[PDB]
From Swiss-Prot:
The N-terminus is phosphorylated by host PRK2/PKN2. This is RNA-directed RNA polymerase. Its cofactor is Mg(2+). It comes from Hepatitis C virus genotype 1b (isolate BK). Binds 2 magnesium ion that constitute a dinuclear catalytic metal center. The modification Phosphoserine is found at S29, S42.
Length: 557
């Protein structure tokens, strides 16, 4: 019952890869310790192969089947529509991997007769054949980190024509079903502020709260054929068109359960019998299966008044404490149950009794004060990976701008405001690129975003307090300070100078730019403005944001 079998062929890149941080004239203004930053490449894909390859055993008990029954009952309430080919085409990212059959993502998006003709042929084949394994491409992701080196993560995805077919069959399902099945436990329905609100209210609702995060080792590889068939059984609970049911069955049998792995050179690399990291159902499948196994494990561990929050393979549980020694014992029983269900731990879960100390979705709740001095909870994270990626993005244009996603999602944080906004607005000003729409990713989906809209986006997501936070917590200050020393990032003195410069220039341009200056950088002046609601912010169409997760799923807006 191995997760993968391999032929020995390499996982190959498509283009020249870089691992060392490129340096340009701007690099040192952000970070001096350049040797701390690296990108993963296909060179390390061999180590990853070793890591992801193991035997899965699964022993499924009555808690598991009880939870599944309840999940199916809720799923039976969902009605999902089939997308037209052209609706599905318009969801495709413009820089999505080209088809092997002589068209690309922009062909798809333009509804080119060639792409559309092929997509219809793939659809027909899905309805007619529910057995033949579908080919997938395997590639090493190029992602940037700070040292202490990780091997490249792998992405496995079918041809572009199949990906459009997945949207047709399942886009409505994966967008709608998880919230119905898991209600408030479904993480991707929340903006950062809403996630914080959910966590704080949940923490406060317990008499003696305890929480933990559970890290499954290599979650995709722990996902078994059983798990994937179970996911399919849940999808089929929905009220679907006959054609959708057939396509979902076909895609499950032919793609989701497993299939051959081909490198970018076209050599057979092996065979997958676990979750594909690059299909539409990656996020929704992982979320459901994690929720299923975790809910069942909660019952096995007899955890009292459990509240779960689940985002794909990321899991937080807040429950009633039975004291430290008992909580430790319960978590060990929880871990044992997860292991039996084929979700063994990476790091063993630790009980926490301070909400700020629980890290989930790489983030934690923290506290600061707004302009009136009121305490405000907000979501933050360790800044090391954001700053390392920002450094890469200072020297190189990347298909997804992590800095922009980080500003959007972490707008209220000390580090996003002091460093990311200051640094990148400086660059955008200098290059006259304030009005150029850039791509970023939110919950796996790709969005095109004009930097000049950032104040309205921030006000809408986080509220005006995001432009006024101060008196951050000692833990947060310590972490940010420690990160800046580690990476050799300049001090507040420097960033405050740059922010005032950036601000003054933005005000001069007028219009949306001045609004950027006024709102984003009010923190940098001695005589602060009183920031008022931005009229234009009421007229932003933020539909599609914070509905669902689409990691690996090839979704654009
Ligand atoms: C106290 C004051 C000087 N201060 C401050 C500096 C901190 C800082 C901590 C570590 C490293 C660098 C700066 S924290 C901290 C705060 O108010 O909590 C501030 O005015 C910030 C300045 C940066 C603003 C984005 C947010 C408001």
């Amino acid at each position: 019952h191995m997760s993968y079998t391999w032929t020995g062929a390499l996982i190959t890149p498509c283009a020249a890869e870089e691992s060392k941080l490129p340096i340009n004239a701007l690099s040192n203004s952000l970070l001096r310790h350049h040797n701390m930053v690296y990108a993963t490449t296909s060179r390390s894909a061999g180590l990853r192969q070793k890591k992801v390859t193991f035997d899965r055993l699964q022993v499924l008990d009555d808690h598991y089947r009880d939870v599944l029954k309840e999940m199916k009952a809720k799923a039976s309430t969902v009605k999902a529509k089939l997308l037209s080919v052209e609706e599905a085409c318009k969801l495709t990212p413009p820089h999505s991997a080209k088809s092997k059959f002589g068209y690309g993502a922009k062909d798809v998006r333009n509804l080119s007769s060639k792409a559309v003709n092929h997509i219809h042929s793939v659809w027909k084949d899905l309805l007619e054949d529910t057995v033949t394994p579908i080919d997938t491409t395997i590639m090493a992701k190029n992602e940037v980190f700070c040292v202490q080196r990780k091997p490249a993560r792998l992405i496995v995805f079918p041809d572009l024509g199949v990906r459009v077919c997945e949207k047709m069959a399942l886009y409505d399902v994966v967008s709608t079903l998880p919230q119905v099945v898991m209600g408030s436990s479904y993480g991707f329905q929340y903006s950062p502020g809403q996630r914080v609100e959910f966590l704080v209210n949940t923490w406060k609702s317990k008499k003696n709260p305890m929480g933990f995060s559970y890290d499954t080792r290599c979650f995709d590889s722990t996902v078994t054929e059983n798990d994937i068939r179970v996911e399919e059984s849940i999808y089929q609970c929905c009220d679907l068109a006959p054609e959708a049911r057939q396509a979902i069955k076909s895609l499950t049998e032919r793609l989701y359960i497993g299939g051959p792995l081909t490198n970018s050179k076209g050599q057979n690399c092996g065979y997958r019998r676990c979750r594909a990291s690059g299909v539409l159902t990656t996020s929704c499948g992982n979320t459901l299966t994690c929720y299923l196994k975790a809910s069942a494990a909660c019952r096995a561990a007899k955890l009292q008044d459990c509240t779960m929050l689940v985002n794909g393979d990321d899991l937080v549980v807040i429950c009633e404490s039975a004291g430290t020694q008992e909580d430790a014992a319960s978590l060990r029983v929880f871990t044992e149950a997860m292991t039996r269900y084929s979700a063994p731990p990476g790091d063993p879960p630790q009980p926490e009794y301070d909400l700020e100390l629980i890290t989930s979705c790489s983030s934690n709740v923290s506290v600061a004060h707004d302009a009136s001095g009121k305490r405000v909870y907000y979501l933050t994270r360790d800044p090391t990976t954001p700053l390392a990626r920002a450094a890469w993005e200072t020297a190189r244009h990347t298909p997804v701008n992590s800095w922009l996603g980080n500003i959007i999602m972490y707008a209220p944080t000390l580090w996003a405001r002091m460093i990311l906004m200051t640094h990148f607005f400086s660059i955008l000003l200098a290059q006259e690129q304030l009005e150029k729409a850039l791509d970023c990713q939110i919950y796996g989906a790709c969005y095109s975003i004009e930097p000049l809209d950032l104040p309205q986006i921030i006000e809408r997501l986080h509220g005006l307090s995001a432009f006024s936070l101060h008196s951050y917590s000692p833990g947060e200050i310590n972490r940010v300070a420690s990160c800046l020393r580690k990476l050799g990032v300049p001090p507040l003195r420097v960033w405050r100078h740059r922010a005032r410069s950036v601000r003054a220039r933005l005000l001069s341009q007028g219009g949306r730019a001045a609004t950027c200056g006024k709102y984003l950088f009010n923190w940098a002046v001695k005589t602060k403005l009183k920031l008022t609601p931005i009229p234009a912010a009421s007229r932003l169409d933020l539909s599609g944001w914070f509905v669902a997760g689409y990691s690996g799923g090839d979704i654009y807006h």
